[PDB]
Amino acid sequence: ARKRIVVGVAGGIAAYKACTVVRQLTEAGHSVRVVPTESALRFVGAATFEALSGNPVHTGVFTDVHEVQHVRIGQQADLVVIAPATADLLARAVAGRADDLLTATLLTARCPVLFAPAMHTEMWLHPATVDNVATLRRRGAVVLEPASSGPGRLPEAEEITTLAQLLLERADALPYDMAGVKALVTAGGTREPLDPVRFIGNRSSGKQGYAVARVLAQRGADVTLIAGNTAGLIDPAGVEMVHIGSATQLRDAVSKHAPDANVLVMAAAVADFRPAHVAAAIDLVRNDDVLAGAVRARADGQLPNMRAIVGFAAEVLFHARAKLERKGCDLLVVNAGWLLSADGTESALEHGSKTLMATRIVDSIAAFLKSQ
Amino acid sequence: SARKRIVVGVAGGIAAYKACTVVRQLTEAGHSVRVVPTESALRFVGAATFEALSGNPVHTGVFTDVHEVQHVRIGQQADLVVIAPATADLLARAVAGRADDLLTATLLTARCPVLFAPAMHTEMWLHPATVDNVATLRRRGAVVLEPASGTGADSGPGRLPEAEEITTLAQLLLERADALPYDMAGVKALVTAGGTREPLDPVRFIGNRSSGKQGYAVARVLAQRGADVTLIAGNTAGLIDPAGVEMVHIGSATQLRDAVSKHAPDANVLVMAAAVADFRPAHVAAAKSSIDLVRNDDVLAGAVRARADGQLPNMRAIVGFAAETGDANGDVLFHARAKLERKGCDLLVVNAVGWLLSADGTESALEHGSKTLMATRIVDSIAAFLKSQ
Amino acid sequence: SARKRIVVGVAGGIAAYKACTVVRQLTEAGHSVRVVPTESALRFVGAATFEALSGNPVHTGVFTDVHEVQHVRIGQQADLVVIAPATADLLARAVAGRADDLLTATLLTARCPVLFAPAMHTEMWLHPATVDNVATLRRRGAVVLEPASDSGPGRLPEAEEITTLAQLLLERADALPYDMAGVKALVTAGGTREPLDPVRFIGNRSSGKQGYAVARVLAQRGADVTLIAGNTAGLIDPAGVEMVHIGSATQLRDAVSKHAPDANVLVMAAAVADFRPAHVAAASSIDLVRNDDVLAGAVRARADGQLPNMRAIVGFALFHARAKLERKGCDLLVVNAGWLLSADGTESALEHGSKTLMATRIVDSIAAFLKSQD
Numbered sequence A: 001a002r003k004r005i006v007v008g009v010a011g012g013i014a015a016y017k018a019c020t021v022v023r024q025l026t027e028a029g030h031s032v033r034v035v036p037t038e039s040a041l042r043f044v045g046a047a048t049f050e051a052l053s054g055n056p057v058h059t060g061v062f063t064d065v066h067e068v069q070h071v072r073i074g075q076q077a078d079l080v081v082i083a084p085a086t087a088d089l090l091a092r093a094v095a096g097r098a099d100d101l102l103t104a105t106l107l108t109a110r111c112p113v114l115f116a117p118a119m120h121t122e123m124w125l126h127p128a129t130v131d132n133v134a135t136l137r138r139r140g141a142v143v144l145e146p147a148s149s150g151p152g153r154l155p156e157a158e159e160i161t162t163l164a165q166l167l168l169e170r171a172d173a174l175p176y177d178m179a180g181v182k183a184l185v186t187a188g189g190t191r192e193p194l195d196p197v198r199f200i201g202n203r204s205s206g207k208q209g210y211a212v213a214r215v216l217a218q219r220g221a222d223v224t225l226i227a228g229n230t231a232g233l234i235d236p237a238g239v240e241m242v243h244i245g246s247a248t249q250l251r252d253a254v255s256k257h258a259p260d261a262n263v264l265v266m267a268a269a270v271a272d273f274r275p276a277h278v279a280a281a282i283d284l285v286r287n288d289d290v291l292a293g294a295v296r297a298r299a300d301g302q303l304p305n306m307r308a309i310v311g312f313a314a315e316v317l318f319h320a321r322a323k324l325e326r327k328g329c330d331l332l333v334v335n336a337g338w339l340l341s342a343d344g345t346e347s348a349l350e351h352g353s354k355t356l357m358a359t360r361i362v363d364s365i366a367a368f369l370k371s372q
Numbered sequence B: 001s002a003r004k005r006i007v008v009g010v011a012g013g014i015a016a017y018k019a020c021t022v023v024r025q026l027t028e029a030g031h032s033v034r035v036v037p038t039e040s041a042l043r044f045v046g047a048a049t050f051e052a053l054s055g056n057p058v059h060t061g062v063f064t065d066v067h068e069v070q071h072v073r074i075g076q077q078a079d080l081v082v083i084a085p086a087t088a089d090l091l092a093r094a095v096a097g098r099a100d101d102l103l104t105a106t107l108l109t110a111r112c113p114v115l116f117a118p119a120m121h122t123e124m125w126l127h128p129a130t131v132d133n134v135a136t137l138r139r140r141g142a143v144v145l146e147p148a149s150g151t152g153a154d155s156g157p158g159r160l161p162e163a164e165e166i167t168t169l170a171q172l173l174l175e176r177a178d179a180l181p182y183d184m185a186g187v188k189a190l191v192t193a194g195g196t197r198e199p200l201d202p203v204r205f206i207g208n209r210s211s212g213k214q215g216y217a218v219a220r221v222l223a224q225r226g227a228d229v230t231l232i233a234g235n236t237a238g239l240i241d242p243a244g245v246e247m248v249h250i251g252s253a254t255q256l257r258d259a260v261s262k263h264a265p266d267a268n269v270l271v272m273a274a275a276v277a278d279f280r281p282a283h284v285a286a287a288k289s290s291i292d293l294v295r296n297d298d299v300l301a302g303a304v305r306a307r308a309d310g311q312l313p314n315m316r317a318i319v320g321f322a323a324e325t326g327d328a329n330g331d332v333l334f335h336a337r338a339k340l341e342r343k344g345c346d347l348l349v350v351n352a353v354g355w356l357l358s359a360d361g362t363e364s365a366l367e368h369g370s371k372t373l374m375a376t377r378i379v380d381s382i383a384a385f386l387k388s389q
Numbered sequence C: 001s002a003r004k005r006i007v008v009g010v011a012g013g014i015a016a017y018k019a020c021t022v023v024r025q026l027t028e029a030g031h032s033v034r035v036v037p038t039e040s041a042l043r044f045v046g047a048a049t050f051e052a053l054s055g056n057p058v059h060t061g062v063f064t065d066v067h068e069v070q071h072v073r074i075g076q077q078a079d080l081v082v083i084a085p086a087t088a089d090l091l092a093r094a095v096a097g098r099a100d101d102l103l104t105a106t107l108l109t110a111r112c113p114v115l116f117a118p119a120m121h122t123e124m125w126l127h128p129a130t131v132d133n134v135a136t137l138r139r140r141g142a143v144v145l146e147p148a149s150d151s152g153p154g155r156l157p158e159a160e161e162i163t164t165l166a167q168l169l170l171e172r173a174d175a176l177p178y179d180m181a182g183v184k185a186l187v188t189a190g191g192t193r194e195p196l197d198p199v200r201f202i203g204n205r206s207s208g209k210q211g212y213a214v215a216r217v218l219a220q221r222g223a224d225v226t227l228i229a230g231n232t233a234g235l236i237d238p239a240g241v242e243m244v245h246i247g248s249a250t251q252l253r254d255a256v257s258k259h260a261p262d263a264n265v266l267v268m269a270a271a272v273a274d275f276r277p278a279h280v281a282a283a284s285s286i287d288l289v290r291n292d293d294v295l296a297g298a299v300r301a302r303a304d305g306q307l308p309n310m311r312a313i314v315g316f317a318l319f320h321a322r323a324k325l326e327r328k329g330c331d332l333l334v335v336n337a338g339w340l341l342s343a344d345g346t347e348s349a350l351e352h353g354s355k356t357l358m359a360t361r362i363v364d365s366i367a368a369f370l371k372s373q374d
Ligand SMILES: Cc1cc2nc3c(=O)[nH]c(=O)nc-3n(C[C@H](O)[C@H](O)[C@H](O)COP(=O)(O)O)c2cc1C
Pocket: A009, A010, A011, A012, A013, A014, A037, A038, A039, A040, A084, A085, A086, A087, A088, A089, A090, A118, A119, A120, A123
């Protein structure tokens, strides 16, 4: 259960944010060794990383040579996380440099490698960085899309920790395969009002919707995410946020952005009905099916971009295979998980995290779009 | 003059003390050696060791003795640059084109053959960045030796080849700059080498005086040019296993043919350079004044006939070896072409106890030189033939 | 465990990069090795090198790790201390009883065997201060390897030699007394090659190791050794041993003839072939002839007073064994399939171990026989 993680820290202003990544990985029961660059010590000192990780902090290969630390750290690692990954670090990782303990450890690691780049937009968008990021991606490393006045800010420490424990559970979880895919996602419970202060709502976290949006984003999809009431979820890096209120405001937001979308995933738990009298200081009216309405602009001919629609269902193997054909979605998800597509294929989602399940969902979407 | 100027670059690997004997052997062979270590190499082996072994000063940066314009004169005057060990860091700097210490600045300056001898932990060696860099150095004209694998649990490639292997591959490039193109990639080659031992008893036996140097040389040259080489060796003159070849040790000629028949199906090229014993001893006792002899099987003929009977499909080139002393009944090329059509070989190496003859009709006079230089002429023709077939 | 603890000390000679191969070899043999360099050795080989090979920390003075009592525990837990190279300066400090760095402090506290492998320029080695210091260390119970051979003596012996002798002292502490000073010895080793024609021949699977061992142990105990070698398993010349190679068994007979006069000990350890082929073809069924018993030829000349100086002859290869010695005429006989029979009837069972170990027993028996007539 307790995995061995290396946390590489390169020399960026965001280095103090790695402290939080180390503390959380440690709180989750994991064994963390911090390997900073020399230039990271100009930002956070070895003492801080030594107290948070509980293990010694060294920057070069020529210390504790008797314990062969330049190979053993990488050979025994279950994951390598670099946060922040500077342009310089990425440039060295691509070149295959091994001139400090962090880059030598990268060459030795035969485990998943997660870069969380952080830098100024101009650096991130410079053609050397762009090619370097592409090369690391095609070599099998995960390079998180940074957050956004432009792109380049380090993703929040929770997003990095979550994606780290994801790769610990499933090494192939985040291939850079959904490039060029545009995706509108919905998540969170909607709030149907009856008062400028009071309302009716439900208990959905939004986590699985957010999880699916995050996994799409970190696999290359240009994601747009319309959220309602969430369990205080913070926005995923690189996804465009559109916050909404009512189950009606959800519909308008969908039909505002859905034409540009290539893929749409209804994870929102929209409430069935809706009140009709809103006193400014029990008259319900049943709300429209936003998912089912999408399949119809589908047919009526104004979604010549849409190539996949996925639905979420609440708990029976065969009892649900009817719902996908009836609802007209390209595939449907349900957990008491099981995934069912419109080609008859069905698979049971082995138990896991909302993000781990989100990867199975995003896998089944990629396969569907291949079959076209 | 036969005295060449060698630059020995030493990068920061555990193997740096092995570079010491490399410089000792090259100076003992009359060459003039300048050692250019990286700064990290100095934490493994001291400058004083290299100054005493080479007799020349040892510096790591370009800003020393800039009056003697050493950052260019050191490269401009070298006949060979050898890097041993070449670390993953150093290969990466050479590929990027860095010139930030004296060694890498010498690499941009040198116009002579350039020999890297990598040494690393296997995981560094198989890392995609390392393998891309090795490919780029090779496409750019450098020779990058395939490392050794010397075990049980911590085996795998990445070990520095033995100094003798490095020094004799260094001398090869001093003699022939184009000796080691990476051209045999994708071919599997089976090589026999050495003499055989035909037992009279457990203790005594009949044998010949074969050193094995010929076959080992072609195995080595094949390995260092890309081939996945297997080497069936009998008795040799204490020859170290070449870097990157699978080794199989046999005692007798019967034991050789069983070993050849065991590995020939996976092979693309077979090199019969082993001096195989013509006749055996009739009775093998168990302890100890006229001993009878029985003829052994012609394993080389055994392979061509099995090939013509469809039992060796992926076999594409069978090269035999022949010893020669003078020509009277015809010329040497006349009798060799007859020996080549009769045995069914694709290539015949006639040893002047050089001549290279080919089933395509090619013939070539091998000039005198080192056994390893002759192996490159041989491997050239094995390549030339495979292009034809 | 068979895992013994070895201290390899390294002093500041050009030969320090050769100690790296000693450390690796002792480590491949399963032992735990702690390298203790002098400060001036770090000018030649870095601490980082010795750390990667030894797998153990590398320190140079006594004040590091004072908590885990290293100034003393490094010596009093060692099973062997080998110094390679041992410079003149190190030998002088060891004789003085200096302890001003970790290596010298370790030497004063060790109670196991101590093996010095000196290496230096010949003028340093033959300077009277060094000569005296080498004699004091030998007198005091240390083993000081005679170094190898500009062309003079003082080269570090090969690593394989040092590790061989290191593992020998791990098996027998008293194995290399400096007892055979002045003795002229001549040894034969290896198999022999009787040619049929210029390229073919008939050989035997003799390694030469057992004969090389006896020549090595003799030279490192004080003797001047001439080794006549046949076909060996690619063996390296022992340091301090005039080498003479031979081919056929008559070429050996010819070689023992030239050199046996000057000698005081003959160790007929070669596996000489008894039969030679009928004729050399210079290019069926092979008839053969017989070769001279070299050992029996050797006892005859001694018996006819042709070898005045030779005081001991040893043969090789105890039901009929005691009779074999009396029939051979040899002074001692080594029987392997060990047992060592003497020319005064006393026999001893050489408990089988390393070849070099039983070589020290063979030299033991030679030593007692030479002191018999002294
Ligand atoms: C205050 C400050 C903040 C920096 N932030 C970043 C950054 O966020 N990303 C980046 O690539 N470089 C950043 N740099 C530049 C790096 O310090 C520089 O590239 C350095 O060599 C670190 O690389 P390394 O940690 O991989 O060795 C910053 C520099 C300074 C002075």
